[PDB]
Symmetry: C5
Subunit: 385 residues, 5 copies
Amino acid sequence: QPALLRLSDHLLANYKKGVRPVRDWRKPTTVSIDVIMYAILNVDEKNQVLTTYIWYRQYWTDEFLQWTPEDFDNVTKLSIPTDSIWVPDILINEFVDVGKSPNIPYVYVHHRGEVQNYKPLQLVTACSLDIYNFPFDVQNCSLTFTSWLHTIQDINITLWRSPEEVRSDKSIFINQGEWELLEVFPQFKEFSIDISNSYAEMKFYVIIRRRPLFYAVSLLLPSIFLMVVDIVGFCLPPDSGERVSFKITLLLGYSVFLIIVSDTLPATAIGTPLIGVYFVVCMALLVISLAETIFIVRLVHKQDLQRPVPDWLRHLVLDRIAWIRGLLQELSSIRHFLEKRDEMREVARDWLRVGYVLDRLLFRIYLLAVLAYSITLVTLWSIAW
Amino acid sequence: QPALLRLSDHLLANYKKGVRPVRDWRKPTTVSIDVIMYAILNVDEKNQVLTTYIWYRQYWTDEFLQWTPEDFDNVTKLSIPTDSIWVPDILINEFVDVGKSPNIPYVYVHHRGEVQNYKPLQLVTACSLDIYNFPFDVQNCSLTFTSWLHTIQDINITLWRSPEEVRSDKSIFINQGEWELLEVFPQFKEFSIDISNSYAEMKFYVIIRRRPLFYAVSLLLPSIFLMVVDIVGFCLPPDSGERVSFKITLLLGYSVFLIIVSDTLPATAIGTPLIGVYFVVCMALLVISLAETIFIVRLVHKQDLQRPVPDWLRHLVLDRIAWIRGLLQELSSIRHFLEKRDEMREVARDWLRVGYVLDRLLFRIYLLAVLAYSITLVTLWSIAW
Amino acid sequence: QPALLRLSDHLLANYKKGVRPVRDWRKPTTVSIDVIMYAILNVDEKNQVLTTYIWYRQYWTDEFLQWTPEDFDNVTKLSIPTDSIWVPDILINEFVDVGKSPNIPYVYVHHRGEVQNYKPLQLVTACSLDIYNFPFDVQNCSLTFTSWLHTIQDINITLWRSPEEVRSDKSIFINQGEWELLEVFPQFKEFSIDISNSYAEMKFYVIIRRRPLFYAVSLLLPSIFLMVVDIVGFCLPPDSGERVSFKITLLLGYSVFLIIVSDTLPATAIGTPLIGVYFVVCMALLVISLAETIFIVRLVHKQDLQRPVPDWLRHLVLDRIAWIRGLLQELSSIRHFLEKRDEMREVARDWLRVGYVLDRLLFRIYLLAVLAYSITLVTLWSIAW
Amino acid sequence: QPALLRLSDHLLANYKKGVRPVRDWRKPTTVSIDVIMYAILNVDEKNQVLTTYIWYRQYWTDEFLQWTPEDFDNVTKLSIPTDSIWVPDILINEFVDVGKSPNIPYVYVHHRGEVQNYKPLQLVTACSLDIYNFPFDVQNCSLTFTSWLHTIQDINITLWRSPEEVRSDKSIFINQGEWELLEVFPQFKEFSIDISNSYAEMKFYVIIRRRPLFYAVSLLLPSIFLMVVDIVGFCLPPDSGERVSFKITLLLGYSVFLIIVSDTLPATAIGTPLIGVYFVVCMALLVISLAETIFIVRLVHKQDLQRPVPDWLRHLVLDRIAWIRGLLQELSSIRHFLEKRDEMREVARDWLRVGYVLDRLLFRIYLLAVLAYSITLVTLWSIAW
Amino acid sequence: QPALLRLSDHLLANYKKGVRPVRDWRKPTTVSIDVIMYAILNVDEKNQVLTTYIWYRQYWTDEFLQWTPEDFDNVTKLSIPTDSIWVPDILINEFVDVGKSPNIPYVYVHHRGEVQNYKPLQLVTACSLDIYNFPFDVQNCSLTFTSWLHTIQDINITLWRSPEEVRSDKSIFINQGEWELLEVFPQFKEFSIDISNSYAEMKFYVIIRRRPLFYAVSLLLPSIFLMVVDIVGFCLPPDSGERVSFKITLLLGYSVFLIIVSDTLPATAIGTPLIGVYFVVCMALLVISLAETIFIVRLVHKQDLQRPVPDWLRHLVLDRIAWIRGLLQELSSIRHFLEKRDEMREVARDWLRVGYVLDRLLFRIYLLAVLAYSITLVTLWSIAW
Ligand SMILES: *[C@@H]1O[C@H](CO)[C@@H](O[C@@H]2O[C@H](CO)[C@@H](O)[C@H](O)[C@H]2NC(C)=O)[C@H](O)[C@H]1NC(C)=O
Ligand SMILES: *[C@@H]1O[C@H](CO)[C@@H](O[C@@H]2O[C@H](CO)[C@@H](O)[C@H](O)[C@H]2NC(C)=O)[C@H](O)[C@H]1NC(C)=O
Ligand SMILES: NCCc1c[nH]c2ccc(O)cc12
Ligand SMILES: NCCc1c[nH]c2ccc(O)cc12
Ligand SMILES: NCCc1c[nH]c2ccc(O)cc12
Ligand SMILES: NCCc1c[nH]c2ccc(O)cc12
Ligand SMILES: NCCc1c[nH]c2ccc(O)cc12
């Protein structure tokens, strides 16, 4: 007689699979698991969901499947079709769709009754991701493995191995994607939503962090030269007039860019992602950059003005010192046509002087406002890094 | 004899699962349920659909599965494969796709015949969402649980617990997403589409509200500085000419933004979402802001005009008081070249005076139109909040 | 003996489900159906497909499942697992994917052999939608229910109820979405693609119409103020020069908008959706609005021109009446420098006169072209409505 | 005895369905098929895939299912559950996903053993589409029906009917979508990837063509008025200066449009779709249209130039003929201020003359370049049509 | 007796399929496979996933299915339903979703026990794609075929054929899509994540390369004329003023284009795709092209300046040589009005001279900077090609 199927006929002859198998019904049949996290596929923050590919193991002690290695030629391990035996009802509490994993048809058994189960599982799972510190984030995500039906009286869930070995386990991992995990933290919990019920749950605080080294040259790099185009915008002379239309073109251009960052960030109602304030401060800087630009051209244009008062003109002098035959009546009619016409040009030349001194000093105080603001952010770089 | 499977063989030997099980066929086998709402996954308003993750319970009294705790060593609870017994045919009337939930293989039984069923269920469900008060909305959504086939003669549906306990149940809930529910309202209904038929239905008026604290800084924040760019637009001098091209650039810029809000809002045929009118009033404000801008430059430009009539000029003076040898003929030819040429400059200077007084007064009445309009909206904030 | 399963064992003992059940094989077992249309989920016109949620009924006379209410305690209705009996092979000919409906496990039977089947069914179905009269359309869509295999010899398909009751049936319906149906028209058809074959088909001319009350304030409302910005565009003085750049900014702005309406409309090869011509006439109106703008500035600019000929100048006068010591040679050198220089300004002033009279008359004939065009469209409103 | 199921019990008592059924194993059981193409659902060229709804037929001679019409009351046709008999393993070699078709549960049998199978099938299939002649294309797509496992020794595949009847078969077809087929070409092939193996394959060169009557008014109609805005762009006077900003606005506007056509066209690496060159020639026409615009304003502006040399000025005259008391020293100081100042205006007037003659002649040679180019394309219309 | 099913009844009478079949349990039942890669469907780099259609083969020696060709009329090959026998548990370690392949119901057997299995399989698989050399890339992608459960004690995996024949196998392949493979490299590996376990894995280094002949005329062709519009931008005269607004329009236009290339490229955290630096160098070239444009107009404008100092003016002369009755007091008042007014025009004319010499020399050094930069890239073409 060929011996291997001789075991299976002897084993599975009366194994009624519709029983949580035990010798004594008071005893909880303890399942015992781990995870080995393989990769992080995608984090679509706008959908508040997370897809993860996880290698996975189980065993549990089965009373009924015990044999002896005698009379079957020293066989201690054996392969069994999964749907021909019992299985625990465990699944994760935070799934969105479980239809992506193939069903492993086969499991092992030992002669003590330790039936061993491996399977892969992918789950698009939903854990509350944090988006506050955006390019430097840690995602305290949670996978809570749970018997959906059975209680502590029926089964308990525990770990395969030492939780320290779960913690720093990077034995197989696809890095160089977007993400990278620092550890996986297991923890038992005893769950009871109500009275007279009690459920085994054992969470997995999987924490991952993002490599910012792509997002810096895709989001911080657009923001920096948007400064220097306006910085070189002040080097335009004020009297040209398109210097106003210069800024608004960039105010149009920055308006385009803030729409692009709008949908890329999720709709998370814990508040603004913190880089968005550092982002949104830039337009108000541009508005006051624009508010400077309108001010001098309201100040300086040929508008038939009044004269500059000397207290501000000495203040302009201080700021310059701080920043650095009755034929006569026809002939009199000629100068009378020009004694004001040349002078109204020079009254316009007087207010013209006021433009350039403000052009110098507001350029520095705009530049020193930005440059002192910039050094604050790179201190936040080394704190985030 | 091991005792647990001794029960299952004694129980399921003749349980023909193709029977709605009862001792007497007049008796309606009453199922009895609840919901425990876990999370709200997504509300895509444009698709008029809603995805919801719901923990769920059932029991019903089964006549045939009764045993005694005697002769089976005091066992009162026991696990059974679901497809080996009867099940009620209930499902929700408003689904779009039920393929996302895993099938729980196992159910409990008691020695009285109370077979107990738990399962999770996600349904992309379609209820008529309201979009009228957009950032402050309540969504009276409905889940109507229904035996698809059986009538009141066959089964009745009732609640597990007190409906008060269903009402304020936030025992497990993923908040800090977008949504948050205030209560879940159950209600029995007796349904009959026709005569000679009657179906048990028990609705669930699930109501949720949106946290506006993200949408305010993503939709109200763009709208406010679009005012102040035009507010500072009047501080441009009128004679520049790009002041017209200034506004149209923003009229172009606001035209961009209204397309962005178009697809974000659904196609709901109950009317405009009410914030859209408050949104669409802004362009007509900008048009009359533009209509001011064209008016003064039609009024003020060097066009070889007629003189200003004094009744409007005294009205301009009132508004200023309200807002605050035959060689002679060659020489006569010289002044004749200039007695009009200097004067036509000054006739242009006369209409130039009319521009700035209108520049002052229309600036206030534009500003006071906007500022009085703005205080109306913040009163609507505290009513919505 | 408990009596209900006593029937089922007596009934299903020898019911070989692999038989289209009849006593005599010449007799066609007539199935008999209806529809009760619940809701219209989505009409994505670009995909030429339609998703519809339909409640659905069947019966057919089964020879083999007859019993007597005697000897089974007056039981005339009974629930049966669907996969334990015969079923007809009907499905709809125009599906794209049938995987969204759950399988109802249960059906009724009567003591005459009328087995009754209810089930829901959703189908993304493909019927040739019409997009010609876009915001006011009726969609003569068709659902042709068909035995996929069996012929008229095997089965016939008929209606449950009177076709009048199918016609005006709005007993359950989710309105206030986008769509609304006026009626559902059933009709039998006898189908034969070839000789020696004949198939029962019974169509359903489901017709729905769209509530335009959202699309009017999302597509007609952008089109109307695009007129009045150019209408107020003529109130710009011609000599400014940005009046040309004014229009092209809107010609740029209208170019943006026609791309937005491009993908929103499907690729239907029956021709242009009829509102698109009314849409596309606007740019050619803007081009000739632009062609006016270039014409006057080609006419009016300081270009050292020739003089205006009086026949057009009297025509300009008619249109104005229709719209309303040898020291002398140094002194002679002075006027010779200015007798032309002042005159070439006035020759430019002469052509300047030609601009404003054309500015008046072309403004009216532009306005009267648009306003008379507009009253044509509102007559088409009351015909469409 | 009821006779119909009397056959089925007599027939299917020992029909072991795990046998490719034949009396003699050398004989290849020839299956025999056709297609009846119903509709073309979508051609997403960017995904290089094609979805098609096909009605489909089979028969094959089964040895084992033969009966006599005697002793069963002259029954020659009969319905059988598909999963209770053999089936051939055929499928198409170019699928992407087969999960969209429902499983027809039923098949016919005849008393000779001709079991007949009908089923529908939709396949998103991948055939190498051609995109070269874009709005006028023919798509030589291929469906190669293949026994996936069995060889020529086991089965052969042939056609049901005459291949001529397959060729012009438009008996049922949903036209008025986008596409329309001219014919379906079947052809047997004998396939062997290697030695000692041989597989029956029978292709289907399905060829379809596109109705261009939508794409012409969605892609050719934008291209034509983009010419005439620049054509009317030359009617702007050169000295205005925004005439340069005119063209670049359209150069910006055409830059927008070429991005819109970029993603609409696939990434097919056989080269550019041929209309794209006719599309991309337009920008280089606009660049040289712009290069004209910069040239004259570089030529004509008040820049204190040198004089025009008469050889080009007589060439400008040829092109015009081709296109059509010591008080004196104060008085001498007056003319010395103006003998050059009036002249430098006239030196600027001399180069001003050069602008308008080039404005005339370059306008024609731009127009005649475009108009002669346009008549080349309409000849390509009648060749494509 | 019909002989073919006589074998199947004799064969499958006691084949308990729940056994990894062998005579002696120490022997590892070696499976033996290959791949025949058919096509590459899509490479969505942003999702870091890859879909591939692969024809596939297996055999393994089965102990139990041996027969003799005697007593069954010389039958050496035979078709068997797959779910009626054993199967190995192999699958690929890098899948995302296996639900797209149909289940082939049938397999072959030989009289030695070589059961032969063919099936197709599509997998959206995840391998770490490289995006560095973007239009000229090679993708060292990996398919690691693995028994998910069984160890080296249970099964070993080997190749069907010689690995050289796998290497250059292009026997069937859909080219002319986007991709093309140069070879497929198989390699055995012996895998053990831990101690006391050992798994057969046999990788497939599938390497493919991209045909750049579409992406060159879709991404390199936009970049080249963006140079020459600014190259012709310097031919604008500086004094016009819109020459500044010229460049910023293209700086706006290039800002549009870099957003388009942003999402087309993935989020790969190995760094920037190398063409992006060659792309992003263009804006900084445009900024310094803009920085030239602001410089000369800051240098040249009528601003009532100081005089040019002769050391720079002789340097400007060097660069030009490198690039090429008391009536008198009324009359004195006349010249005093003009002795400066004409001179301040000429002081403005002096700085005007400085503009054009810088216009010549900066034009060359801008052009020679670009042209010498361009020849570096075409050397990188022939290295990449
Ligand atoms: C398999 O079927 C094909 C038909 O598709 C057979 O080809 C025919 O063979 C006969 C005689 O062998 C010829 O008269 C026909 O002209 C052939 N038709 C075509 C389309 O080739 C082929 O012989 C069959 N092979 C086997 C082994 O049965
Ligand atoms: C498992 O299969 C591999 C083949 O992939 C075996 O490796 C071969 O082993 C033989 C002798 O052991 C050598 O001659 C070959 O050169 C090896 N080939 C390769 C590619 O390594 C391996 O021995 C097998 N192991 C078991 C336990 O059967
Ligand atoms: N060769 C993969 C088998 C395997 C080895 N170690 C594992 C750990 C977890 C798991 O799911 C599977 C495995
Ligand atoms: N541990 C989860 C079991 C569970 C406890 N309480 C529940 C309530 C509803 C439900 O579907 C399931 C449950
Ligand atoms: N309670 C829903 C049962 C039901 C009542 N009337 C119906 C009509 C059609 C249908 O599919 C189902 C029904
Ligand atoms: N009434 C549809 C049955 C039918 C008739 N002719 C057909 C041809 C092909 C097919 O798959 C099916 C059919
Ligand atoms: N006619 C396709 C059968 C076939 C022939 N050679 C093959 C190689 C691999 C495979 O999966 C299948 C095949």
